Amino acid sequence: SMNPPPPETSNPNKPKRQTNQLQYLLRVVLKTLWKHQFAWPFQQPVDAVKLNLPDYYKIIKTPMDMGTIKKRLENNYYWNAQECIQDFNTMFTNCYIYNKPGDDIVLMAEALEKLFLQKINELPTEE
Numbered sequence: 001s002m003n004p005p006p007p008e009t010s011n012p013n014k015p016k017r018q019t020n021q022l023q024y025l026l027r028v029v030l031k032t033l034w035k036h037q038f039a040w041p042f043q044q045p046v047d048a049v050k051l052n053l054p055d056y057y058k059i060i061k062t063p064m065d066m067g068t069i070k071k072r073l074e075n076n077y078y079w080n081a082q083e084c085i086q087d088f089n090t091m092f093t094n095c096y097i098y099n100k101p102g103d104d105i106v107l108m109a110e111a112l113e114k115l116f117l118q119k120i121n122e123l124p125t126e127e
C-alpha cells in the first residue's frame with residue numbers, strides 16, 4: 001500500500017500557549033533524543049513504500065515520529081506536556097507492536113525510551 005499523508009503538525013484554529021514544560025520538551029527532550037546514535041529511524045515518518053513494507057500502515061493506524069513531534073512543538077500544536085508525551089509513547093509503542101521483540105529496531109527504540117523517561121522525570125514544575 002502507498003504511504004498516508006504525515007501527521008498534522010499545525011492548526012491555526014487550535015489555541016496556543018508557551019509554557020516552560022513545552023519549552024523543555026523541545027529544547028531538552030526532543031533535542032537530546034534527536035542527537036542519540038539510535039535516533040535516525042525515528043526522525044521522520046516511516047516510508048513504507050521505500051522500505052517495501054506494504055503492511056505497515058495496515059497495522060499501524062496511529063503513526064508518529066520525532067520529525068512530526070519537532071514540528072508540533074514548533075507550531076505550538078500542543079496545549080500541554082501530556083499531549084506531547086503521548087506522541088513519544090505512541091512512537092515507541094508502534095515500534096514494539098510492528099517489529100519482532102528483540103530486533104535491532106526495537107533495541108534502538110528501547111534505548112531512546114529509557115533516555116526519554118529520564119528526561120521526563122526531570123520535567124520542570126509549571127512556573
Ligand SMILES: CC[C@@H]1C(=O)N(C)c2cnc(Nc3ccc(C(=O)NC4CCN(C)CC4)cc3OC)nc2N1C1CCCC1
Pocket residue numbers: 040041042046047051053056094095098099105
Ligand atoms: C518500519 C519498521 C521499523 C520501524 O519500526 N521503524 C520506525 C523504522 C523507521 N525507519 C526505518 N528505516 C530504514 C530501515 C532500513 C534501511 C536499510 O537501508 N537497510 C539495509 C538494507 C540492506 N541491507 C543489506 C542492509 C540494511 C534504511 C532505512 O531508512 C533509510 N526502518 C524502520 N524499521 C525497520 C525496517 C527494516 C527493519 C525494521
